[PDB]
Amino acid sequence: KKQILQAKRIRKNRQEYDALAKVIQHHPDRHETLKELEALGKELEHLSHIK
Amino acid sequence: KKLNRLAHIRLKKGRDQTHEAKQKVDAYHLQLQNLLYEVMHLQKEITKC
8 A cells, every 4th residue: 555655656756757848848959959059159250240 | 872872972062163163264264365355456556557
């Protein structure tokens, strides 16, 4: 009884984790966004110097 | 004949005295079977969950 109560609590925790992770997976990645932000920042600095 | 009567009375007394204890062992084993079915169902439920 005690182990199955703990098991259902851990199952609820896993379902909360999956519920947040599915919403996060509707958004694009993190590191690729950092790479394209670095590229856009370099291009914006070059365009600002040209302007 | 008196000794035969005494022997049969003692044998019937011993037979009934075994039979009552057999009935009590059967009832207590039935309660143990109930509890083992409960344990097995809870174990199957936690392996499901």
